[PDB]
């Protein structure tokens with residue numbers, strides 16, 4: 001309850017409160033790990049042997065009163081390293097009133113962009129997991145990045161009135177461009193609606209051409225995937241006003257009745 | 262649910278029963294084919310070993326796990342909300358990834374999601390569920406219980422709850438004389454409100470002063486604020 005406080009680079013070392021094999025119960029300590037403006041914190045635990053869910057270590061990244069959450073470590077086992085984002089990291093030790101364990105021990109260090117790997121140059125798109133994929137998985141139908149960021153948002157609504165309404169603006173690699181209606185059918189309509197995370201297609205209505213970007217002619221193929229050729233050549237273009245319905249929302253499909261009881 | 266009645270088999274397909282070592286702790290809400298939504302105060306300190314959580318999908322009776330409709334699944338990822346704070350009980354929400362995909366049936370359906378800036382007017386009745394406890398100092402219920410509670414404004418809830426700090430991420434719900442309110446073994450479940458023949462997810466049972474107490478409504482995490490955070494994981 002009355003342990004240490006803000007530490008800096010000259011020390012970087014601290015136990016919890018009672019390192020020799022037994023810490024006091026009902027403890028609530030705080031180690032505000034500080035750094036310089038622009039340097040994060042990498043907290044590495046050389047030893048971590050605590051009790052069960054009743055006793056946890058709450059590592060935060062506050063930098064202010066609205067503290068975030070990074071990891072909640074507990075139980076006897078080697079825990080991973082925690083990489084902060086701001087120049088301040090708060091560590092909290094919440095303990096129960098019985099069955100005191102040994103305790104932990106950690107030592108941090110200040111660095112520049114620790115944890116986050118350096119993005120690979122030479123037009124290499126970096127997804128959330130850290131790997132590099134220039135064009136092999138940039139919204140093409142593969143699963144290179146395990147975090148799914150390779151298949152992240154590339155098609156979205158443009159000038160949409162409601163939530164599930166708007167244009168069908170695509171993106172081949174970087175440029176966000178709309179799509180034409182050369183061979184627009186209901187099949188590709190519901191396919192695109194499924195790609196957006198919504199339900200099926202509904203009421204595809206071309207209105208008029210207004211966007212000057214490199215619009216793409218959406219087509220279909222019996223293989224299953226959608227082959228979209230970003231060719232900028234078309235007469236009397238037409239923009240599809242895409243309207244997708246919702247997914248399997250909260251509609252009770254069982255054998256239920258209506259009873260006021 | 263303390264003053265509610267039993268729910269029909271299949272009346273709440275989006276209510277998942279989460280077990281931890283052969284014992285149910287906190288219900289969840291089926292949102293996607295492999296994602297759930299549960300309160301971040303029962304998985305607080307248990308997200309290190311997701312394999313200890315078994316998600317029982319489409320459960321009706323807690324003593325009939327051999328049902329042909331029950332589809333058990335495992336958890337492989339527990340993402341607690343970053344803005345969570347156990348001392349302030351704010352941002353009490355967490356998502357749990359399922360091991361394998363589950364097919365949609367008449368007894369297993371995903372719950373809806375509230376759109377951005379959806380004003381829920383106070384006094385509007387909303388239904389709850391979960392295998393909670395029918396009385397504070399008692400035992401849990403075997404059958405899937407259900408109840409109906411109206412929504413209260415944040416100002417009225419703050420006036421009625423001076424011991425806590427009801428922020429803008431908490432939508433309270435409860436009667437004036439009590440009697441019907443969620444209790445232990447109900448946290449992490451959903452606060453469903455019917456709209457356009459659809460049951461949205463307008464809240465997750467977060468905390469409360471006490472259950473089955475007059476003039477003491479329960480606090481529910483406003484899912485209308487965490488809509489984008491949940492949708493960022495479903496894609």
Ligand SMILES: *[C@@H]1O[C@H](CO)[C@@H](O)[C@H](O)[C@H]1NC(C)=O
Pocket residue numbers: 007008009010011
């Ligand atoms: C490091 O620890 C010593 C011992 O208490 C203390 O005097 C010193 O101020 C600490 N370093 C910093 C930068 O505060």
Ligand SMILES: *[C@@H]1O[C@H](CO)[C@@H](O)[C@H](O)[C@H]1NC(C)=O
Pocket residue numbers: 042043044107108109
């Ligand atoms: C903590 O100290 C150990 C041994 O001195 C060292 O290997 C480790 O890198 C330190 N932690 C960090 C985050 O640098």
Ligand SMILES: *[C@@H]1O[C@H](CO)[C@@H](O)[C@H](O)[C@H]1NC(C)=O
Pocket residue numbers: 158159160
């Ligand atoms: C929608 O189209 C109108 C055309 O007059 C334009 O002024 C406006 O900026 C567009 N809005 C968006 C969000 O693209």
Ligand SMILES: *[C@@H]1O[C@H](CO)[C@@H](O)[C@H](O)[C@H]1NC(C)=O
Pocket residue numbers: 182183
């Ligand atoms: C559809 O595509 C064909 C060639 O693939 C093209 O000749 C035609 O103009 C397109 N539009 C139609 C058929 O409406």
Ligand SMILES: *[C@@H]1O[C@H](CO)[C@@H](O)[C@H](O)[C@H]1NC(C)=O
Pocket residue numbers: 202203245
């Ligand atoms: C989608 O289209 C069908 C057929 O026209 C219609 O019955 C249904 O109401 C439409 N969906 C919505 C949300 O309007």
Ligand SMILES: *[C@@H]1O[C@H](CO)[C@@H](O)[C@H](O)[C@H]1NC(C)=O
Pocket residue numbers: 270325327328329
């Ligand atoms: C479980 O529920 C199903 C459907 O309600 C029922 O057919 C079955 O008999 C139940 N199990 C037992 C052991 O009664």
Ligand SMILES: *[C@@H]1O[C@H](CO)[C@@H](O)[C@H](O)[C@H]1NC(C)=O
Pocket residue numbers: 362363364
């Ligand atoms: C779901 O449906 C697919 C295809 O209809 C089938 O192969 C699978 O066995 C079903 N069940 C599960 C749990 O995936």
Ligand SMILES: *[C@@H]1O[C@H](CO)[C@@H](O)[C@H](O)[C@H]1NC(C)=O
Pocket residue numbers: 384385386409411
């Ligand atoms: C909510 O339900 C209760 C009990 O069924 C009823 O007395 C009350 O009028 C309902 N609220 C509204 C707004 O209809």
Ligand SMILES: *[C@@H]1O[C@H](CO)[C@@H](O)[C@H](O)[C@H]1NC(C)=O
Pocket residue numbers: 423425426427
């Ligand atoms: C609740 O928290 C807010 C946060 O700023 C604060 O302004 C307010 O005074 C608090 N109210 C009570 C009753 O603690």
Ligand SMILES: *C(=O)c1ccc(NC(=N)N)cc1
Pocket residue numbers: 442443444445446447448449466467468469470471472473477478479480
């Ligand atoms: C969670 O399990 C939980 C939520 C809410 C309460 N109390 C009230 N609704 N009053 C108890 C436990």
